[PDB]
Amino acid sequence: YSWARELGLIRKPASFMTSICDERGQELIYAGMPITEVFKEEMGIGGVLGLLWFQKRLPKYSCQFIEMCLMVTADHGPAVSGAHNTIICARAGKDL
Amino acid sequence: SAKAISEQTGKELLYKFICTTSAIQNRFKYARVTPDTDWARLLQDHPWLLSQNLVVKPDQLIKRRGKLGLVGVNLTLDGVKSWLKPRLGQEATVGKATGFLKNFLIEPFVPHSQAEEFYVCIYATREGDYVLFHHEGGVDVGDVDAKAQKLLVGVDEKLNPEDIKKHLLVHAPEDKKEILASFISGLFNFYEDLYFTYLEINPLVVTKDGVYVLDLAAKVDATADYICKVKWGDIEFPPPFGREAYPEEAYIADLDAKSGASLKLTLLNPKGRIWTMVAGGGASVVYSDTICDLGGVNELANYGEYSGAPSEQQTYDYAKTILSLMTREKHPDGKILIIGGSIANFTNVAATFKGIVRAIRDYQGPLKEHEVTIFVRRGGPNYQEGLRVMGEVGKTTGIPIHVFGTETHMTAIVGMALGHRPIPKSTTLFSRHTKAIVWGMQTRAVQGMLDFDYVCSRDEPSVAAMVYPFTGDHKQKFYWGHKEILIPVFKNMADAMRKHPEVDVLINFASLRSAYDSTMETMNYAQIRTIAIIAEGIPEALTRKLIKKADQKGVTIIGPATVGGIKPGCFKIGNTGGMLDNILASKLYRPGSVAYVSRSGGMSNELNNIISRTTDGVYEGVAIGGDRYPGSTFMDHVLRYQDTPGVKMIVVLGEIGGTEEYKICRGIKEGRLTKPIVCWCIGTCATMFASETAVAKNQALKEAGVFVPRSFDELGEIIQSVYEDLVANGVIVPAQEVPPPTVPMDYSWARELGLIRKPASFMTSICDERGQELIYAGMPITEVFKEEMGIGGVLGLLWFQKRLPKYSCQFIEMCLMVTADHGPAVSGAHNTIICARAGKDLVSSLTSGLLTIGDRFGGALDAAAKMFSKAFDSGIIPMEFVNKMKKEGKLIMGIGHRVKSINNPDMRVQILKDYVRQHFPATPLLDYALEVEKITTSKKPNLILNVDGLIGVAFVDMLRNCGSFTREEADEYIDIGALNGIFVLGRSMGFIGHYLDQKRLKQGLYRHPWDDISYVLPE
Amino acid sequence: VSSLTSGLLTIGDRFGGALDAAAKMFSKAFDSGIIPMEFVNKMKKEGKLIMGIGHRVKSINNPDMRVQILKDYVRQHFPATPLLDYALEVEKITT
Ligand SMILES: CC(C)(COP(=O)(O)OP(=O)(O)OC[C@H]1O[C@@H](n2cnc3c(N)ncnc32)[C@H](O)[C@@H]1OP(=O)(O)O)[C@@H](O)C(=O)NCCC(=O)NCCS
Ligand SMILES: Nc1ncnc2c1ncn2[C@@H]1O[C@H](COP(=O)(O)OP(=O)(O)O)[C@@H](O)[C@H]1O
């Protein structure tokens, strides 16, 4: 199959479809932007999230805002439903 | 098709459903008599049989019964019995039909004058339903077509009562005009509402007392069953009067009825030396015709066909019937088997041939004894290899088999077998710019179209969008050569039309049930100018309505019951021409000068082959479909071809029945048709069963100037002669040949022909869902239940791939039961509850809890088993073990309890301990553990062997000593965590229990109280 | 536990949903009082497929063994099966 496909003798439709990231290249690509450009352009976590989630280069204010959201939602004590379960679980000797 | 019903069936429906002011007399007053009739029972159900004098007649689709002395009139019940004595069960010859008189009808005698007898008839035609009336009814009606008053009721038109009275009842007695008008009106509404195509009452009697339906002959459109099932009930369609079916005919009829495939068989001469096993309704006729043309009419043994993709098994069952039938008695000159067919559309030729090859191997002894010679001719996907298996079975058995392909003319094998020859509206519908919408989820058809487009060197794909009402709007992946492209799929046709104004063609793959409505809907979008209706089985009355709307809107309808057509280099309707290999083989990627029109789809594929081999190729070809009323006729297309400059000659493949072919004679006469026309009508043999005959039409066409061959065999030769003459006269300037673009083979297909191998990325050994039955580790699911395995047994198969002893299975079930739950205070239950309370679903809530299982919660079973196994296997004595653990600063896993002690035992442990002792052959590890317990309880009384420890060591003893596992196997299962699986599976029940409970208890969101939290944050 | 959960987390909608879906759908239809044929057509009109109807290979001539096993147990031991009776009538129409 590998060989027949190389010589373009047979066609087989792909079962999967992606559009967020391409690891196959010389360089890693996040939604069309190569990883070096991501750092060079100083995107940040917000910027990277814009490419992977929306496949868009967002304005700086937008990125900074996303980062701000992530910061305020980071934690709200151990009394909440989720924190409680994680604590119970950690205490029951489980992994991260 | 339109099918005849019995007089009883018709009368029953009429009495049940006719709505009229007219009082219909003797309603439901009929009794049926067969040779198996219980007269006592008959009289019990019909006491009216003694009330008055009667009439008796056969109800077997015998016409002119009175003239044949087959109607016993004005008889007492005794007289009726006396009349039946010499007739019931007797053989009778009515014209050229000979059969038995088996079914009769008894009705009350209606005294009346000849003046009180009338004739009424309604019948369907393309243009509507004709209503006929005659004041001189009876057995002496004569030529009713010229004599009777007649009126056409158009398509979707109402029968006006004023018109009945004014035009139909002109010669009716004045006093009976209102009652007749009222009855005829009700009869017409009845005729429409129950989907009749023919209804005749001869005579209809109207006396001073009321209306009497003395006789009734009717046909219904059988395809309307899906609508009318409720009113029709278990309606029976009687076969015409004549001989009854041989047991072999009945067998094949049963196979046909129980499958989507077409399997037909009729014996002509059981003692004939010529047997046929032909694929396709069209080809079967053609072969039968050729045999008759070569004088074999008296030696032809059968008429039959197989089509619609039958399974290898069905093909085998069909073939064995033929082979059985031909090896009953020897013939001095031996026998012949003609295994023919046209070019198959998509079905792999090797598949059906495997069934036939199996039948030949089973009947090789009788076939050699009866000196049978087999002739094969078939085309289609991978026909080359299908012909190889045929040639090979001939060599291995010794039976003479002569195998031929597409290169041989279809009917050439006949002459070879007999030893006569040696064995060697709008004019344009489509353009290269045509864009279509496909109604339905037809991935293969769309891809087929797109491969034709690519190979035709079209700039864009011919399919713009698809309409599939069950899914939401999405895009489907397809291939433009080797490049993947996306085609939009719409839930609503309105959206497809809106987003694609460039589309003017619609290909309708809607089922026969929804074809009508989807076509009518399409006609509300003016952009659509051509509609191809694929569906076979649309009721005639509905197709007429489609025709009417299309005609008034100028929409060209191709179909119903068609594959479509093909315009080489431009457009291909759906599945026309089949796989690329056939499109390439018959050079359909580039246009020629020859245009054709056919009824049969199969024959269109054969015509593509014929034309490509004899001429410069096909310009445009159309299959008009096989329904009674095609949307577009032979003439419709012939005129388009006459008016297309690129068309230099026309080929028409006609058929027996209808008078369409005569419009061509007329067209030529009138000087409208000037282009050379080649025509051959199939069904020249059918006259061995007047203007409508194939023989009559072929004669008329030849006289009109049409080029008509002697037989179907000479069709290739005549086409080539016409073509060569047109080249010689410079009418045809053939173009230089350009090679088409190449497209890769489909992986699916390559894998089928075993051309490529691709290694599996995965490996399984627990279950196989691919089979005819589900298999759990080698044991089929039915055996699982038959052997009464239970949950324990099933777990043994899926987890260990072993058939365990019953006591082992029962023990596993016991473990699952004790581990099921242990209250809501435990880590896992708590999380599930929290989760359920936070409004999550079952799976999220369960998993949230299960994710706590492993170390400090639920770990103990695996831990205990591992610890004790290690200690035991190391050979240290229990006391040495206890002290070793103390020194290492470790507690024993599976030892200790909060309240339970040596004097106050744990019930779960008691239950299990007792079962294990009683049923397990050996328990060495349990014995060792219990000895450790003797030591620890002597320290503190609550240092008992707990349920986790008990299950752990019991399970190890079960694996090691049940005798299903080697030590290696038993030790691997423990290590890979089989014991964790037990706890997880077991407790999963309890957790689902809690989830349901919290939802049922309508428990709100949990927030942990701050009072229970010690906040120790930095400063 | 991680491996099991990873798989279980796919259960719910397009995978494993059918049991719940079928039970809900048929109960609704039965309880609403509509006759099987009315139900079949209602679904078609609404653009919905019947949950618990259809098979890739198995047909009315080639039955599913699991369905055979279960149908037969239920017929034998259940005092009353009105919804099953209703569903089998819907199956008569769809097949
Ligand atoms: C001495 C005393 C404080 C503690 O005794 P205890 O609870 O029985 O002792 P422990 O908690 O250490 O447990 C007993 C043993 O069980 C062992 N053990 C506990 N759980 C175990 C497990 N799961 N697996 C293996 N061993 C286990 C411990 O290792 C310990 O072993 P050791 O005796 O060799 O050290 C207690 O008995 C006491 O209060 N006695 C009263 C004496 C008195 O009258 N005092 C004077 C007042 S006048
Ligand atoms: N029940 C009846 N009462 C009186 N006359 C009847 C009755 N049934 C039939 N007849 C007469 O017998 C004739 C022949 O019967 P019919 O049903 O028309 O058979 P066919 O037309 O096939 O010969 C009728 O034309 C009519 O005169």
Ligand SMILES: O=P([O-])(O)O
């Ligand atoms: O049966 P066909 O010849 O119309 O395909």
Ligand SMILES: [Mg+2]
């Ligand atoms: Mg008559």
